[PDB]
Amino acid sequence: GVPTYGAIILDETLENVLLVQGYLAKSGWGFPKGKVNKEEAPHDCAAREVFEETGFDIKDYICKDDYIELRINDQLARLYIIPGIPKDTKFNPKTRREIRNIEWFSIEKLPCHRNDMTPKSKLGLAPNKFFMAIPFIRPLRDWLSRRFG
Numbered sequence: 001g002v003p004t005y006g007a008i009i010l011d012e013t014l015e016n017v018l019l020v021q022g023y024l025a026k027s028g029w030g031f032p033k034g035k036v037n038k039e040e041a042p043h044d045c046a047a048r049e050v051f052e053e054t055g056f057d058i059k060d061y062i063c064k065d066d067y068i069e070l071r072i073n074d075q076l077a078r079l080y081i082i083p084g085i086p087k088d089t090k091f092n093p094k095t096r097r098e099i100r101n102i103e104w105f106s107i108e109k110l111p112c113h114r115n116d117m118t119p120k121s122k123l124g125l126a127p128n129k130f131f132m133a134i135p136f137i138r139p140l141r142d143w144l145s146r147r148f149g
């Protein structure tokens with residue numbers, strides 16, 4: 001799959017993270033990210049996708065070694081970690097045709113797994129609007145503990 005790049009933006013308290021909500025297949029909440037273009041560097045793709053989805057330019061804040069990368073179904077997603085962005089920042093996507101809404105969420109309240117259906121003796125996982133964000137949550141919490149503590 002084509003690699004994706006984007007950001008985990010945190011506020012100044014390190015409490016909250018910025019998520020975006022798309023439409024249709026992308027209808028839940030997730031970190032801002034998207035597919036790398038031909039010959040485009042990872043940092044440039046992250047900034048481009050993040051500015052397209054949120055209107056905030058991370059270019060001056062990216063740190064090369066500060067990211068979480070996950071491979072999910074043989075597609076690689078790398079989110080650069082961007083702390084210290086004020087919660088009163090005005091975020092506005094490029095077009096509302098791709099992004100419904102943009103919100104801060106408390107890290108400690110976000111799930112780091114979906115719930116099973118063991119109450120119903122049924123296999124699988126219950127729907128969860130944070131599905132796309134969930135895989136990054138435990139790694140982010142561990143990364144923040146190691147880097148700030």
Ligand SMILES: CCc1cnc(C(=O)NCc2ccc(F)cc2)s1
Binds near residue numbers: 131
């Ligand atoms: C089917 C499972 C999914 C549910 N939500 C998905 C998703 O990607 N939401 C985040 C997002 C990322 C980039 C955007 F441009 C717009 C929204 S995918």
